[PDB]
């Protein structure tokens, strides 16, 4: 039962890590993180085993401070859907928009948890698109800010844990053995090609 796709993918791993400063002259405050599931090599190798995929996602935000102690401070997470403009500053108008859903949660509360459905104009996500427009499948954004009035003087460090749900896959393909070089390109190295089987002494042994 633990060999199906729904158990091969559905497990709350760690996708991303977002920093935040909220300082003085560099009064950024916000921290946008374009969300793609190809961050860490493990999930990319498990997701490039297939050609087409379709899934919902559960997102869990676990926010700590620099040292680690957490004081009660309001935080706004904001999901910018595909096509909507990203926020530019801490207090721009793209923060008070009603289309962009927000989650208001304190630091002392349990970690935040939302769910994002299938949001592609095609029938399924495709990672290998042979042609000309990388494809145009996207999931959105997750800009986060400290809700306050007087500038907060702390630097947080959020973690974004993703779990896939209701996963369906199509057109299996072999597993990438060569190392990675870029994010959105399967570029390998021409020289120094690593063999898929470690060498042994001779062909008439069992090493």
């Amino acid at each position: 039962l633990e060999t199906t796709i729904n158990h091969f993918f559905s497990r709350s791993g760690l996708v991303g890590v977002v920093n935040l400063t909220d300082g003085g002259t560099d009064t950024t405050g916000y921290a946008t993180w374009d969300i793609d599931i190809m961050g860490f090599v493990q999930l990319r190798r498990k997701c490039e085993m297939f050609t087409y995929m379709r899934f919902n996602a559960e997102f869990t935000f676990v926010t700590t401070t620099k040292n680690g102690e957490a004081r009660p401070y309001m935080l706004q997470y904001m999901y910018v859907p595909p096509g909507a403009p990203k926020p530019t500053g801490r207090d721009a108008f793209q923060w008070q928009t009603a289309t962009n859903p927000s989650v208001f949660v304190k630091l002392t509360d349990p970690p935040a948890q939302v769910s994002v459905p299938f949001m592609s104009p095609a029938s399924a996500y495709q990672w290998f698109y042979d042609g000309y427009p990388c494809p145009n499948n996207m999931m959105g954004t997750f800009a986060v800010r400290v809700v306050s009035r007087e500038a907060s003087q702390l630097k947080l460090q959020t973690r974004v844990y993703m779990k896939l749900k209701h996963v369906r896959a199509w057109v299996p393909r072999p597993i990438r053995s060569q190392p990675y070089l870029l994010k959105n390109f399967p570029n390998y190295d021409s020289s120094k090609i690593t063999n898929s089987a470690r060498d042994r002494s001779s062909i008439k042994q069992a090493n």
């Binding site: 199906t4 497990r11 939302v114 199509w170 089987a197 042994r200």
Partner: protein, 219 residues
């Protein structure tokens, strides 16, 4: 206004918990699905496909010629040609196959396997070979008579050109498949007396996998 009490486990975030989350877009219906051919349901459907083993993984070999067992006419009547292990989740020839990559994501496995050979050579060249399975326990056999007392299939080149040996019951020594020169490699005039044999291998219907775990091919 029902009374309630909070037990241990409150306000924790369990990773493998099956709990629903609040949807971000309510009422938003996604794009309806179409019938895309080639749907997978379990990984046991991927372990049941034949796949070229890299049995010639020694050094002084180029990229592709690591997938071939060389057979020649210079070798004597009775001699050893090639031997390898069975364990798919082990550093060796089974690291290049597909079942050897899938059985790395899981930490326990069981069931039977199937290793099928295929002779790439001339049409006018004949000869016999002895493929021989030796179960776990003792080491690799030394002579052809010791091998033919174990499990053995006499595969010739005249009629059959692709033999298949089923290996029973293997789990997390693990068994040894040897491949011996039975008689010779005869060849008529004006014909190259050097051919190759491709080895392939897959799992069976009895192959079952347990305990998920992240792999270690990547860094």
């Amino acid at each position: 206004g029902i009374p309630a009490e909070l037990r241990p486990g409150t306000n924790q975030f369990l990773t493998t918990d099956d709990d629903t989350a609040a949807p971000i877009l309510p009422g938003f219906t996604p794009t309806p699905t179409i019938h895309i051919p080639g749907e997978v349901h379990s990984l046991l459907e991927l372990c049941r496909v034949e796949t070229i083993l890299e049995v010639n993984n020694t050094t002084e070999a180029t990229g592709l010629t690591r997938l071939l067992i060389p057979v020649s006419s210079q070798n004597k009547a009775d001699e050893l040609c090639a031997a390898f292990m069975v364990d798919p989740g082990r550093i060796g020839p089974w690291q290049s196959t597909l079942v050897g990559q899938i059985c790395r994501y899981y930490t326990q496995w069981s069931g039977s396997l199937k290793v099928t050979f295929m002779f790439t050579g001339s049409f006018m060249a004949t000869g016999k070979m002895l493929v021989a399975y030796s179960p776990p326990g003792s080491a690799q056999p030394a002579n052809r008579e010791t091998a033919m007392l174990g499990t053995h299939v006499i595969w010739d080149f005249g009629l059959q050109s692709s033999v298949s040996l089923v290996i029973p019951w293997i789990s997390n020594t693990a068994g040894v498949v040897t491949l011996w020169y039975q008689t010779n490699y005869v060849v008529p005039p004006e014909t190259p007396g050097e051919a190759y044999i491709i080895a392939m291998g897959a799992a069976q219907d009895n192959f079952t996998l347990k305990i998920c775990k992240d792999t270690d091919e990547v860094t």
